[PDB]
Amino acid sequence: QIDYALTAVKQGVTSLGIKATNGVVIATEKKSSSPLAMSETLSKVSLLTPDIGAVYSGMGPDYRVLVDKSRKVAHTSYKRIYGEYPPTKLLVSEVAKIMQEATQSGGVRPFGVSLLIAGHDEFNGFSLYQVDPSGSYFPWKATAIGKGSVAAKTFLEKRWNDELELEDAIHIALLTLKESVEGEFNGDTIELAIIGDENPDLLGYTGIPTDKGPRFRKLTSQEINDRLEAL
Amino acid sequence: LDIYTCNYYFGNTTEEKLQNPNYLNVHRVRARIGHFFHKLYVFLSTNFENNTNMFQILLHGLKVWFTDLGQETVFNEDPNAFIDVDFLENVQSLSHVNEPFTRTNFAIRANSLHQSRVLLHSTNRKASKLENLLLVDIIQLATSLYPDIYKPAQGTLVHCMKQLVGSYGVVINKIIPSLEKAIKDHDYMKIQVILNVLLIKKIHRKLMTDYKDIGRLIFLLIECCRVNELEIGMYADKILTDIVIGIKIPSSVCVISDQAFLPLAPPDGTINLQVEAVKLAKKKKREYYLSLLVDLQDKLLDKLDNEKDMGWKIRMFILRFVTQIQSNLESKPDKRAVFSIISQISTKHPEIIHLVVKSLLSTCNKIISLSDYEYDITRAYKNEFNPSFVEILDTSTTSFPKTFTEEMNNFDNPKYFIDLRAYVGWLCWGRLMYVMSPKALKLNLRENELEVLKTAGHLLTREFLRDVTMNLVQDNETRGVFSSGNVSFFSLVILLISSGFCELNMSDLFELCESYYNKDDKASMIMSVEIVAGLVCGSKFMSVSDLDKRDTFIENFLAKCLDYELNHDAFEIWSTLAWWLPAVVDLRRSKTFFCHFINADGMFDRESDAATHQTSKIYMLRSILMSMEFRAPDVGKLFDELVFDHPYDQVRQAVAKLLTTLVQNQSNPSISDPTTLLEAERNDPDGLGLPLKSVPEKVDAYIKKQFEIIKNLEDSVVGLNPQQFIKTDYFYRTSTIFYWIKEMARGPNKVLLVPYLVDYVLPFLIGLVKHKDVCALASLDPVRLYAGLGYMPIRKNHVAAIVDYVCSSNVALSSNQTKLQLAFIQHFLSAELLQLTEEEKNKILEFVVSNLYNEQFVEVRVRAASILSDIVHNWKEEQPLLSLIERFAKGLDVNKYTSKERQKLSKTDIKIHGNVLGLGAIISAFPYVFPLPPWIPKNLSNLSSWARTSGMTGNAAKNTISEFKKVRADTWKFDRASFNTEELEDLEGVLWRSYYA
Amino acid sequence: NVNHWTNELKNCLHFDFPVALRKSLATVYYYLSLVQGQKVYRQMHVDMFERLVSLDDDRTQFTELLQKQGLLLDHQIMLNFLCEFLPYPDPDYARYELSSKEDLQLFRLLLKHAHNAKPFFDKSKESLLVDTMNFLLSSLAPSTMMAVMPIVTSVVPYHYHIHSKIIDYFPFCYSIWSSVSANVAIDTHMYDFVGSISKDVHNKILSSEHEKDVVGVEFGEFGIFTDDQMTFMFNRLQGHLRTDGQIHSYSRTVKPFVYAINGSKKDRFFEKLVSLAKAIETFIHPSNNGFWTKPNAKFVHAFIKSYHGRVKYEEDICARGVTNGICLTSFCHEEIVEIFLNIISLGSQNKNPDIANYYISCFAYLLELDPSNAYLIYDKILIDLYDTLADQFINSRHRIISSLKQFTRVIRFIVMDKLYRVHITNVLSMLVSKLDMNDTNLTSNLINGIVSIAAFIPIQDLTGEDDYISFESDTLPLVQQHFYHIKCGESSKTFRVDDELLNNAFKASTTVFQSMLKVYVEKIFQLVDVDLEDSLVTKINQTTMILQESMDDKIFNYFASLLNRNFWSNDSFKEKDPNYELVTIPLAALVRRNNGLSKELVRTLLFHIKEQIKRGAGSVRSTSEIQQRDVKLVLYLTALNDVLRNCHESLLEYSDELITFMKYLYDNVTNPPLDVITSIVIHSALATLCTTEITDCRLFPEDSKIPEKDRWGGLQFDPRRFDKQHLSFQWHVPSSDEITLSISILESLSEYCINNVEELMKAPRHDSEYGDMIQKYVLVMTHTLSGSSLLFDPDFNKY
């Protein structure tokens, strides 16, 4: 029964993640259920904290209500006690605990998604985690989930060294996604986020030098196309 | 040439085709497509290595180009627009009826025959230069690194070796070279892939036949046994282990009735010199192979002896020289092997040691079997079972039956032994009987085989058996266990010992044994007793002066161990030996061992002390006597020595379980001749046969005594109580006899127990008005046994006397042990139904019915009726039936009496309780007559005016109407209509319990 | 090499050869199987022998002909092997131990081989019987029980002599038996024995040589069995079904009972069988499931197979002049039905559907006996069915599905009895309309009925224009009267109708075929949109293709303009992912029968495919899924594949318009999931020119190949069902014209692909609408190699 949910994960659009020396990167494709639909109204790559993002493979809805339940747990169980935001390791723990309970609870099915959660905490540095429907979670240098899972996972072993700059890992995760792509391949059908330098540009305010802004940045429709030309 | 013929258009191999423009046109086009697929493969592996979707579509274009030649095999079976032959066959074919088919079917059947004539054409061929180029490509792909590519390519290269000749050769001579590379190019996932290839059904199979290349390969899979980094080495071990389990070679002259090839012998004169030529090449092809393995054998022992320490895949070697320095069909027993296999005891590792034994014991039982076969390797597979020490015996010999009996009791001057399970005899004599000779020899072998066994005994030091058994004990603490593999190893040390090669003297195994006997350590005792069983399997080994040092050690040891002070841990072990040993060796190879358990200083008789002890014997003597069952059983003693009077249960029960076994040993009917026998079976009362197993008079006497000794003592409890009962001798006897019956009715002794039921066993048991509460105390269930004896192997003539015992005119004797005999009947009936003569089927029914009426016990009038239905169910004939219905409904029918009276009668009159109980059973005996018999309504109506009366009968007439209305429930939508009688209403009261109002 | 040839031989049995050579071949494989000393593929050799000695190689029996042709085999070799499985003293040497698969599995083979070569042990070595028993017997003891018994049953020959017969040894079997209680480890051998021996005596008594040295074995009341011997086996079988459940494959356990019946002295036996049915009665009841419900079912079937088995072997012999009073009479068939009818009716309602299909399958076996009773069964089955279609069982699921299985396993027989047959038009047009779209199961069990009625009935208007006709007025009124009669307790023997009126009813009943197919096609298009899947999608296509072949040109030419009509104007391919199969294939099967229909059907699929492409279909890229705006284009393309494949020579007309359309379909339209489809067009057209196949499957040929119009039950029982003028199959054979267009294409598409691909070797690594195009041309190339596969020669490279 957990086994059947991992199966809904095995199909459903491919997504991936790559840790580097100075950043993390996660991406998936935006398969348009129609051309009539405006694909900018749905986000497969969601912000959890300004230091932490997430992507999935599988059941759309189960991801949404998991991204919501997940943002909240970041406050209710960490920020409202210690004044900081949670560290990747622990926010991940609190999500696994959330899914692991849909498993061992009666009257409910587990979630139809595997999650890739990427982020940076001051003490543990960068890290990238996978969370399964089983509630188990593992730390990755890089991996992929979904259909293209096997092709891409093999390409990542081939191309990954522990000396990658974040720009190198963006480059990789675009190629990796180019071979699996189901629909068209541009900035309107690729979602890519990074966990890099602090972006003060994006704080919304200026006056306390101790807080410096989001590490999580979601690349614009433009930034993507720009990289795909010099590709 | 051609025998398949499928309308190939271009003429069936006439080379009516070669002179056809349309046919060079066609293949000149498949050539281009072939050379174009290579053009595209090189263009992709060069420009697009990192793509899976492309390479899959190409790999299917090759699965096609290589296969869809004569036929169409991919797409072969997609539902298309033809009706399916297999479907239609199911619809139309009746069985035992030749082709009852409609025209439609005949037509597919025929089309189905054409289509199979096409697929018949063997497409197997010689590689076409270009075809070799594409098969090399398909390998670089099954050697690729992407699972999304290498997995279809492998499946695609298998459909391609089905199609090419000795293509396996092409594949290996590419694998190995490019695996040897991927190892000196480091941790490659190309190694992980090459190993995945070697596990393909078709390859892994052809591997155990590649004698040339498996040399080099095992040494590559070894280098591979280092997870320098991956799932490798786990796969290399599964693979090297899979390998040890294949291979071998057959020298042995097909023990063929030369009539297996003669009938097909062509006239051709000596144009069958060819045959004696093949015989010779398929004989040095073989002898080369056989040498390649010996070369591999010695080239490994090199990497095991010389490689200071490789770790624990030290195991492949040993797991293999073993299925080799003991194969035969050749295999020159190497002495350097027996050295190396033993010097691996120095790694003090549980798994290695368990194997060095398992190996040393086979590597000898092979050399041993060369002497016994006189190097006539053929002689194994010839059922003229050679061994110089086996001897056949004629059993028809007027006199034989009493050689056996009086030779099985002979322990001192023994003439023959049957190690194993003694078949001949038992039923009858007449066959020839394979047997073994006394003081069995060792026999001679050539020098090569001699120096090999020397190199073991010179290695079996006082110290080496110390190290090795120690280990086997510690790996053994976890489990318990016995494994004969252990014992059949000690007999070996014994052969080696006093045959010359070891010189350890037996007095060394007597310490090694007395040594491992810590009354505390279980796995340590198990090693001691594993040792004993070896000294008794070591009489297939000379010295009558050692067979006396051993008979002497054993009576001394069984003393220390079994003569008082015995835990449920020892008993657990020794009792294991008793069930086993007598089955792997005739116990007369020892004067002391058996003549020790039968020395019965153990069975006291009364209780104003502590009586004494235990089945500190009984259950072990028994488990030996159980495993012989035939042989040795002279026990004039035991019978005269049994107890019955014993106060304790653990013994009363055991004395019983032993007698049971003592009887099964004198019950074998072993007759003189097969002819003398079948003449006894033919002249039997039952058109059937002889009671198989029949207890011999001198015993039918003993038993009869024990029952009539207990009838003598009925004065012993002239009036005592349950507390002063368990203490009387009458009880003690009775309890033992019971435990005995319980154990006869179980298993293969039933046919022995029957004669006694009618006069002895059933009059007993119903020793129950001999006190109900006395049974609850010493927990005995008689009721459950007496009735559980309703089912069982009864014979035509025994039925007679049993039905006559029940249905007794002395019946009236018993009291609520009546509802007991009545339940024994209900069971007999179910297991002797269809076998009871309509005479007996009546003596029963007239008893059952005489109980619906017995004044006093209301309890039974009801258990009788419940049973009367079991009868009337198989009673469909309508005049036995309709004549009962009448007999019963005469005691009630109509308003014979006016209301006030029915009330009075319903409470007291027995003749009417019966009449309503009976007529009630009849109706409850037809539960589901799918359309309802009109005698039922009309006779429930006669029953309803009575279920309206509260009393005792009017009660068991409400039972009958509710019981009924209930089982008719689902068929009731309909049964309603056969009740015109507004005596539908008449059936509404009926069920009343306290919760209704 | 041995194993290879031993196979090419297997391949040779498909044609014929001299019994004098079988004498030879058999002898080779008897002694070959028994080799020792090397790796041997025994299963193969014991199977050669068993096929060389086959006792029913198309009604011919090769064991008889080999006995008569002087075959004799050594028994000492066989028994000597089967005896290595005895306790050899000195454990160190015993090689075979039962219990451990690898060994028991050889033993089970030798034993099987022996059973095969039992009849070739010298009938003339008088002391071969006695010698062999006097040996096995002395070997019998508790520890051998397991290996001895089976041997006897398969290595000792059934001999019968003047002094020592084999039934001489019975009193000893009923000594072991009758001493242990029911124990399958034992019984199974006793029944196997006294039964394959009772079968023997019976076989031998009839026709052939009533002897073998002794007709001194008398039959009587209970086969070759004593009064008490029979009595015992009855109460033991009852023991098995009521108490101890100790039996395996029952075919074997039933023999003795069947082959102890004596047509002229039954009575005393049927008396014993009846009381055994009355005992067993309750345990079959649908709500008394237990350890027994298997044994009772697997038996009541095994027994009625093994009875009908015998009957159809005797009726084959009273086609050889020899009645024999031992034979089974019309009155045994009667009392057999009397016995097992309530029993069979109860079982078929059982809660387990497998345990039911046993009791239900017994109706077919009983009806083949054409007993006087036949009506009793047709009576039940038809009420149970008409009740079910009148929803009188709606509260109970099982009765509905059950009484549709009862009726299916019996359709073929109803088409015969000149009374029931009337109902069959009604019952069909009722099943068709009651095809549910929610109940997958009810539908699978209805198609069962619908396809069975079609498989044994010609969909034909049989009216000579007789004016009274009409389904009502003439059929319905009678059908209702028969049913009213049957329902009120009365049976069909009491049912009197004019041979005039009942033949009006039957002929007028063949009118409704038209108004009913309009309702089947409707129900198909409704099913295109259901998550029924696979097994049942196929079975439905069988029913649509069988229905077609059982159709006269009058009706078929209607059915065609009704698929054609509904295929175009339909509102039925919405839901996600459709079963196109259910509608495209039934078209192809129209073109099989009438190539003329292709010229225009294809040109309409193309000016409708060009239409869908031109308006954006397959414009939007996706692996993994077929876009729902495409679903229409995909229909027309599957149809074009399925319908070219069956076009054949009629494709010569519009040859050039196709090729040039195929090139258009590949110039436009790129999309990995559509290319696996479009690339099949090339195959379904190369295969259709040069593949040599059938073409005609009609129940009855031409429309006119008159056996007359008493032609219902499809000749399935008539001996003319297979004289050559009926079976006048059509067949497509590839002509010099077709092979020639065949080849034109091969080179024209072969070039088209290789060019367009040698072009794209000016590499855009990006595009990805590039790897889509190369995949496309390599699929078109691939499917160009297949189908077109029949023109290639494996051997070409030798030459």
Of A31, A35, A181, the CB nearest to C768: A181
> Which residues of B, range 528-547, sit inside 8 Å of C by Cβ?
540
Which chain C residues are Cβ-neighbours of B684 within 8 angstroms? 171, 175
Method by which the model was determined: X-ray
Interface test with B, best of C172, C457, C693 (most B CBs within 10 A): C172
Gap from C473 CA to chain B (nearest CA, Å): 32
Which chain B residues are Cβ-neighbours of C726 within 8 angstroms? 103
Which chain A residues are Cβ-neighbours of C766 within 8 angstroms? 231
Nearest to C305 by CA among B96, B97, B99: B96
Q: Are A218 and A45 in contact (CB under 8 A)?
A: yes
Sequence-separated (6 or more) residues with CB below 8 Å from residue C545? B81, B82, B83, C585, C586, C589
Of A178, A182, A184, the CB nearest to C624: A182
Specify the 3-state DSSP secondary structure of A25: strand
B146 with A151: Cβ contact below 8 A: yes
- In degrees and rounded to multiples of 5, residue B207 shows phi and psi of -70, -40
Residues of C with CB under 8 A from a CB of A: 620-625, 766, 768
CB pairs under 8 A between A and B: 18
The residues that bridge with A17 in the sheet, in sequence order, are: A26, A143
Which chain C residues are Cβ-neighbours of B80 within 8 angstroms? 585, 588, 642, 645
Q: Are C543 and C589 in contact (CB under 8 A)?
A: no
Gap from B47 CA to chain A (nearest CA, Å): 14
Which chain B residues are Cβ-neighbours of A150 within 8 angstroms? 146-148
Distance CA B423, CA B393 (A): 13
A157 with B50: Cβ contact below 8 A: no
Gap from A149 CA to chain C (nearest CA, Å): 14
Closest-CA residue of B relative to A182 is B53
Distance CA B588, CA B541 (A): 15
A154 with B51: Cβ contact below 8 A: no
- Name the burial class of residue C711, with classes exposed (0-12), middle (13-18) and buried (19+) by CB atoms within 10 angstroms of its CB: middle
Which chain A residues are Cβ-neighbours of C768 within 8 angstroms? 178, 181, 185
C620 with A35: Cβ contact below 8 A: yes
Q: Write out the H or E segment, with its range, that includes residue A130.
A: strand A125-131
CB atoms closer than 10 angstroms to residue C99: 7
Gap from B585 CA to chain A (nearest CA, Å): 55
Q: Are C243 and B830 in contact (CB under 8 A)?
A: yes
Nearest to B144 by CA among B104, B183, B178, B185: B178
A151 with B145: Cβ contact below 8 A: no
CA atoms within 13 A on the CB side of B137: 25
Of C38, C281, C785, the CB nearest to B65: C785
Nearest to B922 by CA among B954, B955, B876: B876
Length of chain A: 231
Q: With helix as H, strand as E and coil as C, how does B281-320 read? A: HCCHHHHHHHHHHHHHHHHHHHHHHCCCCCCCCHHHHHHH
Q: Are C336 and C307 in contact (CB under 8 A)?
A: yes
Sequence-separated (6 or more) residues with CB below 8 Å from residue C2? none
Using only the alpha carbons of chain C, give its radius of gyration: 33
C789 with B71: Cβ contact below 8 A: yes
Alpha-carbon dihedral sign for residues C671, C675, C676, C677: positive
Residues of A with CB under 8 A from a CB of B: 150-151, 154-155, 157-158, 175, 179
CA B792 to chain centre: 24
Alpha carbon distances (Å) from B560 to B519, B563, B564, B580: 11, 6, 8, 22
Alpha carbon distances (Å) from B158 to B62, B135, C792: 12, 11, 21
Gap from A183 CA to chain C (nearest CA, Å): 5
Written as one string, the DSSP assignment of B584-641 is HS-GGG-TTTHHHHT---------SS------SSHHHHHHHHHHHBTBS---HHHHHH
Give ∠ CA C612-C617-C619 in degrees, rounded to 5: 145
A155 with B147: Cβ contact below 8 A: no
Two tokens, residue B72: 């169409």
Q: C598-614 and C581-593 are packed helices; what angle lies between their axes, rounded to 10 degrees?
A: 150
Closest-CA residue of C relative to A230 is C766
Which chain C residues are Cβ-neighbours of B630 within 8 angstroms? 141
- Name the burial class of residue C233, with classes exposed (0-12), middle (13-18) and buried (19+) by CB atoms within 10 angstroms of its CB: buried
Gap from A3 CA to chain C (nearest CA, Å): 22
CA dihedral B80, B83, B86, B92 (to 10 degrees): 170
Sequence-separated (6 or more) residues with CB below 8 Å from residue C370? C333
Closest-CA residue of B relative to C234 is B834
Q: With helix as H, strand as E and coil as C, how does C262-322 read? A: CCCCCCCCHHHHHHHHHHHHHHHCCCCCCCCHHHHHHHHHHHHHHHHHHHHHHCCCCCCCC
Closest-CA residue of B relative to C58 is B98
Q: Write out the H or E segment, with its range, that includes residue C565.
A: helix C553-568
Closest-CA residue of C relative to A228 is C766
Tell me whether B608 touches chain C (CB under 8 Å): no
In the block, which residue shows the tokens 């698929």? C563
Nearest to C584 by CA among C649, C533, C552, C540: C540
Alpha carbon distances (Å) from B544 to A86, B438, B630, B913, C89: 87, 10, 27, 84, 22
Tell me whether B101 touches chain C (CB under 8 Å): yes
Tell me whether B252 touches chain C (CB under 8 Å): yes
In the block, which residue shows the tokens 């012998």? B265
C714 with B381: Cβ contact below 8 A: no
Beta strands in B265-409 (DSSP E): 390-394
Which chain A residues are Cβ-neighbours of C624 within 8 angstroms? 147, 182
C622 with A181: Cβ contact below 8 A: no
Nearest to C405 by CA among C443, C355, C436, C361: C361
A183 with C768: Cβ contact below 8 A: no
Which chain C residues are Cβ-neighbours of B970 within 8 angstroms? 287
